[PDB]
Design a protein around this ligand. Structure first.
Ligand SMILES: CCCCCCCCCCCCCCCCCC(=O)OC[C@H](COP(=O)([O-])OCC(O)COP(=O)([O-])OC[C@@H](COC(=O)CCCCCCCCCCCCCCCCC)OC(=O)CCCCCCCCCCCCCCCCC)OC(=O)CCCCCCCCCCCCCCCCC
Ligand SMILES: CCCCCCCCCCCCCCCCCC(=O)OC[C@H](COP(=O)(O)OCCN)OC(=O)CCCCCCCCCCCCCCCCC
Ligand SMILES: CCCCCCCCCCCCCCCCCC(=O)OC[C@H](COP(=O)(O)OCCN)OC(=O)CCCCCCCCCCCCCCCCC
Ligand SMILES: CCCCCCCCCCCCO[C@@H]1O[C@H](CO)[C@@H](O[C@H]2O[C@H](CO)[C@@H](O)[C@H](O)[C@H]2O)[C@H](O)[C@H]1O
Ligand SMILES: CCCCCCCCCCCCO[C@@H]1O[C@H](CO)[C@@H](O[C@H]2O[C@H](CO)[C@@H](O)[C@H](O)[C@H]2O)[C@H](O)[C@H]1O
Ligand SMILES: CCCCCCCCCCCCO[C@@H]1O[C@H](CO)[C@@H](O[C@H]2O[C@H](CO)[C@@H](O)[C@H](O)[C@H]2O)[C@H](O)[C@H]1O
Ligand SMILES: CCCCCCCCCCCCO[C@@H]1O[C@H](CO)[C@@H](O[C@H]2O[C@H](CO)[C@@H](O)[C@H](O)[C@H]2O)[C@H](O)[C@H]1O
Lengths: 103, 459, 170, 108, 171, 592
């Protein structure tokens, strides 16, 4: 079931060409011919400035002077009030709870 | 409307008096300037339409269709000038003249107050369209495509003329502003049943309604690129625009007369979407895709709800850009391999990386990815037809699945897989082609930021 | 910036801080950083802009539409009267759409504002929303895409006839 | 247990009783099939390897296929007609009687 | 199309691979592989070819019953997890013809060597076509086998797309 | 308020910035992946601030910053919901995604389109955060479909491979079937409640919610690969390993579960919907865990583990425990993403081998990968006090003591046992025994991008469950009184699963040959669902397409030959004049 002598010779001839072709895909030394911790923090410091501080300035300015100036644009869930709290706006004191049965 | 009619007419002497090698530069440049001024039509009011004169008016329905029309002319010029490069100079100028004369009839058609004037202009668009297909198509059966297109139209349009003349005799006017105030209800009778059909069948053929649609794939396979672009983007919407106007005077008879057409549309959209899964001609696949999308528009118009009319308007604009872009993408492959067979040239993303991106974006809008105006229009129709009957959500949902399947199947078949070995003439995409694709998709996606200008009068 | 009667909010009740820990609160120090690094420079830019705005004070106005006769007073087919009545009815229809939108905004703000107590505390808003939607439905629902003052009137008269019949049978 | 072939699952070639009885007639037919394949292969290869050729090698088999292919009609319409008509008659009847809830329904 | 000898040898290899999928462990596989081989060695010298065909047919019935439903597949074989994984990176060499001159200028050495190959191709083609004409009988090829080059300076006919095909790992 | 709302939006705006820089404003191609990874790491930090404010005081708010469109009485605004679920999910998703991108910088190092790969991962994360913060159903739909199409693009990453394209389209197919449910719910809510905003839907609190919730359940079934629309998730293993890690942990697959958690105000009043989701999860968790018992591809075993874990989450929704279901999303993210990254470590060291039958003997050869895999497996199987324990055992206890479908309860417990079996299967066949891989040894895990990314997730798999459970406010009353045999069920069945799995695994080493049973084939071939459905359904659809101008034209042509085939004879023409004149008088009386 081996190759026939003509099959071997054709394969040999193709093999020589394929290897010469593959060799020629190697680049030369001049190719491509192109046309003409401080570093850590500084790179991280410039990144925080451009990608956090400037965006937050813009967003805050936008939320403060354009969005929150319209009704119901930023709606909060009102704070929870527990027995014993003091309200900042009015000074009101929330009475304690009734005394617990021992448990 | 004379500020748009006259400069459009002047494009003709511009083209004929240009230097031989400047005909595409001059016509393209000046048609783009007309397109820019078309944005002055956006002066729409909440209550009243923009009524210029005794002949022309512009409401929120006609304005987006006008802007789309005048935007499409420079794109067709850009798309045509390559395959017409060997044509002799006079025949090039005649070709550009047909496109200009098509714009002239179209902008007058969309702005006429009186319905007979709309009819004449609506009919006049046939002539340059037919001439563009039969004279400048490539294949033998462009002659048959012309006859099918011509005689499907006239089989429906002649009864419409008789009905329109009958309506004027009875009512005294066909001015659309007058009809809004003098409209009377249509009672039940065999005479009114045929009046209804005569008022509607011509627009059904244009859309085209499922079962009257076989002229469309025939026409697209034969038309040159500019022919397909205007046909898919504007000429189909003449029927959509006509129905949206004439249904005013068909109540309450539309209540029961719409059923058989809704059934044809609702089932037809599934049939045509499935057919797309087995189409072997790329242009024929896009043609069947249009039929499926326009079936939604017909349903929207017939059920007559504020939500459905808004969806119909958005769908008509969104489809026009999307389908025109797909024919342009299909044509860019054709100008390299000279075949419309979808399976011939595969794996083109390996060879044309940026054109693959345009294919991706066109497919994503075709399957109505949120928040493209393609989805906005489809969603509004789906919303409104659910109220009409909840069971419609089943057919609407199934159609969404099939549309995604054939849209991406188009993308996978032509752009992915392995490239065909023997096709060795796939040259890099030209600047003209990249500009052409981007001049479709960019305005389409920018409309997501301000959809209200394409939602029509019911907005 | 807006009318507090149209878009009301109840008075706000914020409890005072009451720390039961010796550990510092990170949120308090981030809040001070946010004030110094974000708010103050933002406020300085805004105050410069408003100073430019004060040098050029000009006004715009809210358009006022005189009332014109309704479609009920229009003779049949008299388009000049019908036109003005129809345009007026269309302006009113858009206004009533925004009245419903205001009431829906009130309801949704209350739902978020009241938290886990919304079901009880937003009853007044729920009731007002229920009534305006009913009135809006009576006026404009089922008219169709080709709506008009004429069709709107035809619906009211149909409703009035059904109410007259029901009262008679009683 | 024997293999039962189905439309979507073919009989394996190793289990096909006609794969082990190959006569002179069957061998002759296979050679005739290989000869047709080889002749087409050569015709394709002389163009595919031609250094001067730029374009597409038109395949008449592909053209015949697309040409042949480019060359349950009222029943579902009637079916769907009765489904939607029956549903909308039922719905319309309830609205006229007031028995359908439309409390917050003001979009349509 | 396949000989009897080829069918038996194909079955042996296929049976051994599925047996390995079952056994997993190398020591267990070695043991059962040798038992499997002894089943083939038993009937190695069967000269009655009707009996031999019966043995193979039953063997293939046995294989179909006992095959692994999820056999091991080499990653880059058809059906494996890496099959065709790198096709997207294979770009045909004619694409370099369309490179812009500024792109070609980045690789002056590579593109000069490419021109020599294109010249070798052009000058060889006529002799290749002639060699195939002389060696092909009247009816045309009866098989797909291609011949070697017979002289010095000739190249084996139809070599370009074999020799210059993309690398298996092209990027 | 102003810091809370500003920083929650900064988190989102920061993630989009690397996408905008692709427009070439200030673009450094040399290390775009490092740029994308850095933004994810900074977004995680910025999101921890509003999360800390929520944990402190329970601060929640809605931001409706941009009015996009008003459709009569339906106002659509870009609206963000910074609440319990978003405040907890976003930092987790960003933390997991931070590790996956760092892992990706090593795994995809040789991909020539690595830049595009990181853009697609970033878009995939962005669409998920749109989905999780959405306050109205239209904005949520944008994210819903966005993750769907990003999964199409990443599953089909190697687009020259037909099976990759096929799997990518399959995911689109199954998810668009579930999308039918999504649009149904959208249509019902608009028609019946005049809104798409979550605030108005919960305020109006409809009681006839069967239809809208059935739609949501259908949409969740597609997105979270529940039984019926489940095959696409294991098929998604076509994508590069980092895709699977992010697809299965912090993005796509949990979206279906997340949608149902968003709507617990409606589902908690609907027993019928609870019964449906309970049984759907139960059949899912058991079926997919059963498939996993026989799978030989390491990526598919983990994929079927995700399907089974998703089924458990669906079960938790079915017992009316939405917050527990949400806790399992968070805890699951840490160790499921770690398991994929460990499998990717193995596959890379074995030159793209994914069959566990060719691994083995890696316990010592790959120490750090081994440690993370053991931790991940023990976390998955509910090892006490690791991240998984803090959700799964609460879920099993809640299910054991609920008023529930009895069959669903048993299926979930058997599936918990099966989790132990297929986890043992990975550990046993990958790490233990003798090497079964080829002879050229290129095992090497000594890369900082690999070690660090797995290290951060390993720490998450130890403490994240404990930390999260001790900081979130209580929203239910947990069941804590029960008999001992209900208390220890998950632990006992897990230990029995391990014991059983070890007997079976060691039986493979005996010199006995075993024929295949029917149960083995059912498991290996996935209950035959893909074989039947993926052949029959496409065949029926793709075939049904196959199964007058010509007549009118024929009629005219025939009528023309009648008119024009005339002899040209004077005699015959004038003879016809006589017939016409006779007929005009006799028949029609035209002379009167
Ligand atoms: C006022 C007038 C303004 C006019 C409009 C200005 C915008 C145009 C600016 C382009 C400027 C030219 C440029 O430099 O672009 C370079 C840019 C990147 O350079 P490149 O790497 O060389 O690209 C070549 C490859 O084709 C690149 O291949 P690629 O695949 O990597 O990139 C293509 C990418 C397209 O990328 C995008 O579209 C960005 C998506 C972010 C949104 O395709 C996708 O990824 C599709 C994903 C879609 C699913 C997204 C999920 C839905 C989210 C919906 C969110 C809605 C908001 C809420 O080129 C392109 O992307 C070409 C397409 C341009 C179309 C822009 C459409 C944006 C929408
Ligand atoms: C030939 C088919 C014609 C249908 C019969 C229409 C007709 O003649 O009706 C008469 C009626 C005019 O009668 P009149 O006295 O004015 O008013 C009282 C109504 N009995 O007419 C009317 O009231 C309405 C007339 C409307 C005009 C109908 C136009 C032709 C209708 C047939 C075509 C409709 C189907 C279109 C098919 C397109 C094919 C693609
Ligand atoms: C369900 C809804 C789903 C929606 C999906 C829509 C998809 C579209 C893609 C999403 C786009 C996301 C970005 C949108 C926010 C930015 C646009 C914007 O806010 O500007 C417009 C805004 C006007 O505010 P508004 O009254 O709400 O608008 C009514 C008209 N529609 O302007 C303002 O009010 C303030 C403008 C001044 C800003 C000053 C700060 C300048 C900062 C430096 C420049 C950067
Ligand atoms: C008295 C009532 C009638 C009023 C008529 C008013 C217009 C009279 C125009 C007379 C001038 C015609 O001009 C004559 O035709 C054309 C265009 O003009 C010119 O030639 C043309 O060739 C080609 C087009 O084919 C182009 O480069 C360009 O359009 C022009 O150069 C001739 O070189 C010129 O001699
Ligand atoms: C794709 C095409 C779709 C086509 C759809 C066809 C819809 C068919 C609608 C049938 C109804 C036609 O309209 C119907 O005409 C008859 C005319 O005699 C009217 O009835 C009138 O004539 C009959 C005589 O038989 C009298 O009994 C009746 O008192 C009188 O009013 C009905 O009031 C009207 O309902
Ligand atoms: C929620 C997370 C909880 C994690 C719980 C982990 C459960 C682990 C259960 C292990 C049970 C003991 O498993 C026991 O291991 C010993 C190891 O000598 C083995 O005992 C015997 O079997 C094997 C095979 O014959 C031999 O290799 C072994 O030398 C021999 O002693 C058995 O395989 C098993 O009896
Ligand atoms: C309802 C309004 C719309 C209808 C418009 C009708 C306009 C009249 C059209 C032309 C009629 C005659 O046109 C003629 O028709 C016949 C049959 O199709 C064609 O005949 C052709 O097809 C038929 C089969 O279909 C063959 O038997 C025949 O050998 C072949 O020549 C002619 O090629 C065509 O020229």
């Amino acid at each position: 079931s081996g190759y026939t002598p003509e099959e071997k010779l054709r394969l040999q001839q193709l093999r020589e060409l394929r290897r010469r072709w593959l060799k020629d895909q190697e680049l030369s030394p001049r190719e491509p011919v192109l046309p003409p911790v401080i570093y850590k923090t500084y790179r991280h410091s410039i990144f925080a400035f451009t990608h956090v501080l400037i965006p937050v300035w813009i967003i805050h300015y936008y939320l403060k002077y354009h969005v929150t100036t319209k009704p119901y644009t930023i709606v909060e869930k009102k704070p929870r009030i527990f027995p014993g709290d003091t309200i900042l706006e009015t000074g009101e004191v929330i009475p304690p709870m009734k005394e617990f049965p021992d448990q | 409307m004379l500020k748009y009619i006259i400069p459009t007419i002047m494009l003709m002497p511009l083209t004929w008096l240009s230097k031989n090698n400047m005909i595409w530069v001059n016509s393209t440049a000046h048609s783009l300037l007309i397109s820019f001024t078309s944005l002055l039509l956006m002066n729409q009011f909440g209550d009243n339409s923009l009524n210029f004169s005794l002949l022309f008016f512009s409401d929120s329905l006609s304005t987006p269709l006008l802007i789309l029309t005048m935007w499409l002319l420079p794109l067709m010029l850009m798309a045509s000038q390559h395959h017409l490069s060997k044509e002799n100079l006079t025949r090039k100028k005649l070709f550009i003249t047909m496109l200009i004369s098509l714009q002239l009839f179209l902008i007058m058609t969309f702005t006429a107050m009186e319905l007979i004037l709309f009819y004449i202009l609506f009919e006049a668009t046939l002539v340059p369209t037919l001439i563009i297909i039969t004279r400048w198509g490539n294949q033998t059966e462009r002659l048959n495509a012309g006859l099918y297109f011509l005689f499907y139209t006239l089989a429906g349009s002649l009864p419409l003329l008789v009905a329109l003349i009958y309506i004027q005799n009875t009512v005294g006017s066909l001015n659309f502003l007058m009809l809004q105030y003098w409209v009377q209800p249509v009672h039940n009778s065999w005479s009114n049943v045929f009046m209804w059909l005569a008022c509607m069948m011509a627009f059904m053929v244009k859309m085209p309604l499922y079962g009257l649609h076989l002229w469309l794939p025939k026409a697209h396979v034969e038309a040159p690129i500019a022919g397909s672009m205007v046909l898919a983007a504007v000429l189909l919407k003449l029927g959509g625009y006509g129905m949206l106007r004439i249904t005013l005077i068909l109540n309450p008879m539309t209540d029961f007369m719409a059923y058989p057409f809704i059934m044809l549309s609702l089932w037809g959209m599934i049939m045509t979407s499935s057919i797309c899964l087995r189409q072997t001609d790329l242009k024929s696949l896009i043609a069947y895709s249009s039929v499926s999308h326009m079936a939604l528009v017909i349903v929207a118009i017939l059920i007559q709800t504020p939500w459905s009319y808004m969806g119909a308007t958005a769908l008509m604009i969104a489809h026009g850009l999307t389908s025109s872009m797909l024919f342009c993408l299909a044509n860019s492959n054709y100008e390299r391999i000279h075949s419309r067979t979808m399976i011939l040239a595969r794996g083109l993303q390996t060879l044309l990386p940026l054109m693959a991106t345009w294919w991706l974006l066109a497919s994503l809008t075709n399957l109505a990815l949120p928040p493209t105006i393609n989805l906005i229009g489809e969603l509004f129709v789906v919303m409104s037809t659910f109220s009409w009957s909840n069971i419609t959500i089943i057919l609407m949902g199934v159609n969404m699945v099939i549309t995604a399947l054939y849209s991406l199947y188009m993308l996978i078949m032509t752009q992915r897989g392995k490239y065909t070995y023997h096709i060795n003439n796939i040259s890099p995409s030209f600047t003209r082609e990249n500009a052409l694709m981007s001049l479709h998709i960019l305005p389409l996606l920018l409309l997501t930021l301000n959809p209200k200008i394409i939602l029509g009068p019911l907005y | 910036s807006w009318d507090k009667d149209v878009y009301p909010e109840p008075p706000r009740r914020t409890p005072a801080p009451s720390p039961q820990t010796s550990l510092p609160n990170p949120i308090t120090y981030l809040t001070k950083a946010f004030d110094l690094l974000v708010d103050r420079p933002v406020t300085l830019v805004r105050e410069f802009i408003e100073r430019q705005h004060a040098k050029n004070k000009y006004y715009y106005y809210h358009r006022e539409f005189r009332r014109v006769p309704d479609i009920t007073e229009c003779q049949e087919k008299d388009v000049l009267c019908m036109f003005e009545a129809e345009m007026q009815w269309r302006r009113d229809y858009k206004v009533d759409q925004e009245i419903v939108n205001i009431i829906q905004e009130r309801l949704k703000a209350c739902q978020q504002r009241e938290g886990e107590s919304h079901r009880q505390n937003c009853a007044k808003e729920l009731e007002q929303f229920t009534q305006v939607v009913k009135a809006y439905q009576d006026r404009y629902h089922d008219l169709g895409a080709h709506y008009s003052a004429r069709k709107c009137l035809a619906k009211q008269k149909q409703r009035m006839l059904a109410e007259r019949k029901a009262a008679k049978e009683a | 247990p024997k293999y039962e072939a189905s439309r979507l699952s073919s009989l394996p070639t190793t289990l096909d009783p006609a794969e082990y009885d190959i006569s002179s007639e069957t061998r002759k037919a296979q050679a005739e099939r290989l000869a047709i394949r080889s002749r087409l292969k050569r015709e394709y290869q002389l163009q595919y390897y031609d250094p001067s050729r730029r374009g597409v090698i038109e395949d008449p088999a592909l053209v015949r296929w697309t040409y042949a292919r480019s060359a349950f009609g009222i029943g579902p319409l009637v079916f769907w007609y009765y489904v939607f008509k029956t549903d909308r008659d039922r719905k319309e009847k309830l609205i006229q009687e007031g028995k359908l809830d439309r409390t917050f329904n003001i979009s349509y | 199309y396949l000989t009897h000898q080829q069918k038996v040898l194909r079955l042996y290899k296929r049976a051994l691979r599925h047996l390995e999928s079952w056994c997993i462990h190398r020591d267990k596989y070695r043991y059962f592989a040798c038992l499997l081989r002894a089943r083939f060695d038993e009937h190695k010298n069967e000269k009655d070819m009707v009996k031999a065909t019966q043995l193979l047919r039953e063997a293939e019935e046995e294989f179909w019953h006992g095959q692994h439903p999820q056999p091991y597949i080499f990653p880059e074989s058809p059906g494996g997890t890496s099959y065709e994984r790198y096709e997207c990176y294979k770009v045909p060499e004619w694409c370099l013809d369309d490179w812009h001159p500024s792109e070609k200028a980045m690789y002056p050495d590579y593109f000069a060597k490419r021109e020599q190959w294109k010249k070798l191709r052009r000058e060889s083609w006529e002799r290749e076509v002639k060699q195939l004409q002389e060696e092909t009988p009247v009816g045309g090829p009866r098989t797909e086998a291609l011949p070697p080059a017979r002289k010095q300076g000739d190249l084996p006919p139809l070599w370009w797309h074999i020799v210059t095909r993309p690398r298996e790992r092209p990027m | 308020m102003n810091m809370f709302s500003s920083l929650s939006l900064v988190t989102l705006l920061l993630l989009t910035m690397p996408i905008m820089m692709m427009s070439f404003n200030t673009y450094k191609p040399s290390n775009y992946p490092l740029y994308v990874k850095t933004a994810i790491s900074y977004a995680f930090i910025t999101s921890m601030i509003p999360t800390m404010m929520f944990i402190h005081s329970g601060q929640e708010l809605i931001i409706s910053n941009w009015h996009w469109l008003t459709i009569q009485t339906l106002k659509l605004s870009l609206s963000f919901k910074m609440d319990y679920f978003s405040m907890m999910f976003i930092p987790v998703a960003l933390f997991v995604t931070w590790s996956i991108m760092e892992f990706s910088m090593w795994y995809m190092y040789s991909d020539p389109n690595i830049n595009k790969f990181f853009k697609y991962l970033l878009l995939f994360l962005i669409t998920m955060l749109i989905l999780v913060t959405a306050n109205n159903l239209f904005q949520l739909f944008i994210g819903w479909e966005g993750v769907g199409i990003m999964s199409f693009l990443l599953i089909g990453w190697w687009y020259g491979r037909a099976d990759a394209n096929t799997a990518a389209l399959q995911a689109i197919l199954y998810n668009r079937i579930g999308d039918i449910g999504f649009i149904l719910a959208m249509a019902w809510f608009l028609t019946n409640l005049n809104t798409w905003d979550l605030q108005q839907i919960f305020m109006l609190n409809p009681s006839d919610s069967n239809m809208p919730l059935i739609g949501l359940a259908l949409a969740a079934t597609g997105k979270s690969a529940q039984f019926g629309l489940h095959p696409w998730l294991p098929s998604a293993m076509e994508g590069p390993t980092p895709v699977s890690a992010l697809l299965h942990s912090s993005t796509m697959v949990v979206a279906g579960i997340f949608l149902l958690i968003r709507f617990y105000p409606l589902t908690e009043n609907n027993k019928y919907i609870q019964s449906i989701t309970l049984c759907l999860g139960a059949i899912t968790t058991l079926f997919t865990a059963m498939c996993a018992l026989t799978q030989n591809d390491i990526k598919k075993i983990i994929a079927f583990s995700t399907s089974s874990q998703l089924g458990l989450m669906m079960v938790t929704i079915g017992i009316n425990q939405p917050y527990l279901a949400f806790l399992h999303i968070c805890t699951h993210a840490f160790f499921k993403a770690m398991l994929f990254m460990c499998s990717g470590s193995i596959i890379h060291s074995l030159n793209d081998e994914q069959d566990i039958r060719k691994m083995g003997g890696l316990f010592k050869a790959m120490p750090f990968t081994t440690t993370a895999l053991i931790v991940g497996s023990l976390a998955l199987t509910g090892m006490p006090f690791l991240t998984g324990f803090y959700s799964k055992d609460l879920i099993i206890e809640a299910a054991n003591t609920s008023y529930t479908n009895a069959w669903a309860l048993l299926m979930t417990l058997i599936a918990t046992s099966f989790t132990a079996i297929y986890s043992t299967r990975i550990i046993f066949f990958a790490l233990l025994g003798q090497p079964r891989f080829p002879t050229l040894v290129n095992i090497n895990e000594n890369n900082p991008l690999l070690i660090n990314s797995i290290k951060r997730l390993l720490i998450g798999s130890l403490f994240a469950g404990y930390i999260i459970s001790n900081n979130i406010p209580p929203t239910t009353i947990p069941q804590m009184t029960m008999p001992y045999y209900l208390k220890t069920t998950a632990l006992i069945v897990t230990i029995l699963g391990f014991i059983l799995a070890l007997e079976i695994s060691n039986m493979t080493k005996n010199l006995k040959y075993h024929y295949p049973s029917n149960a083995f084939k059912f498991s290996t071939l996935l209950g035959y669902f893909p074989t039947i459905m993926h052949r029959l359904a496409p065949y029926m659809n793709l075939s049904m397409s196959q199964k007058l101008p010509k007549t009118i034209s024929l009629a005219q042509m025939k009528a023309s030959t009648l008119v024009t085939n005339q002899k040209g004879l004077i005699k015959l023409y004038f003879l016809s004049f006589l017939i016409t004149i006779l007929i005009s008088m006799i028949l029609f009386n035209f002379h009167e």
